[PDB]
Amino acid sequence: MKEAFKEALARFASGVTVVAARLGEEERGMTATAFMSLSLEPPLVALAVSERAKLLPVLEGAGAFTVSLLREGQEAVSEHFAGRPKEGIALEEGRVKGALAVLRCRLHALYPGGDHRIVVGLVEEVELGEGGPPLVYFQRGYRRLVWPS
Amino acid sequence: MKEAFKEALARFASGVTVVAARLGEEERGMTATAFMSLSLEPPLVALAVSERAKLLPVLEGAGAFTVSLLREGQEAVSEHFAGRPKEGIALEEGRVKGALAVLRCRLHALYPGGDHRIVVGLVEEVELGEGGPPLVYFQRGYRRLVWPS
């Protein structure tokens, strides 16, 4: 169903993130390409989280979450938090270690989004990893940017 | 201010779109990287439009808008609708001709977004251009994908 719509979306390239939240010792991570900057003042970002995602209840309960921007070569991390378990993949400090960047957010708002919820985060902390090319998703596959030396 | 936050966002790669709307005798196009798929059922997309964008009142009044996903080689189009005019660039049929895809949306909902407005569109029509690589923005510059792969 909705073949044309899906094809159009497959034509929007984007980085890949892992959104995570924790309540006590209960921690959940979820791969998401539906991420975008939203505001500078205040510093906000928005994401789309499935209404059926295990992450949602924990994120709402915690009132805070992190967003890790994956770098080139982190396909395993993306796959793991996408529901397809991989060996040796785990969150550290509530985020993905070695990511291009991590945004630690306070939950700012939740708005209706069809079969997804629009999650708005107020950025309170930023962690920057080493520079380099990103993990990209486009046309149903992981892609690399032209980034020569 | 917000140097680390801006750097983190510069590390999230994305395609580039031109959002447009028409009302009465006015029609405006605006370049935006803040776009993401939102829902399958109903078919929704979300975008962040500056609260001071000239496009906003037109889009609100029209109750409908288009989103064109730019392909590789359309940097001039992105620049033009970003506020840096380029010779001969203009919308055709309310969207960008030659784009990878065009989504004609009904304005579904709007939500506060700090210095931006969260705009949700319900996709009513999809126009698919001929297949090919996309225009990408990452690390404060236009990029290309290593394609095919």
Residues of B in contact with A9 (CB under 8 A): 37, 45
Q: List the one residue out of A54, A37, A144 whose CA is nearest residue A101.
A: A37
Which strand (E) or helix (H) includes residue A60? helix A55-62
Structural contact between residues A110 and A119, judged by C-beta atoms closer than 8 angstroms: yes
Residue B73 backbone class (left: φ over 0; alpha: ψ -120 to 50; beta: rest)? left
- Which domains, and CATH codes, for chain A? 1-149 (2.30.110.10)
Spell out the residues 6+ positions from residue A86 whose beta carbon is closer than 8 angstroms to its own.
A76, A77, A79, A80
- Testing the interface with A: which of B136, B137, B140, B144 to mutate, by most A Cβ within 10 A? B136
Query: CA of A131: which chain B residue's CA is closest?
Result: B11
* Residue B64 Cα, gap to closest chain A Cα (Å): 17
Q: How far apart are CA A62 and CA B5, in angstroms?
A: 22
Six token digits for residue A146:
């032209």
Quote the tokens at residue B123: 């996709």
* Approach to solving: X-ray
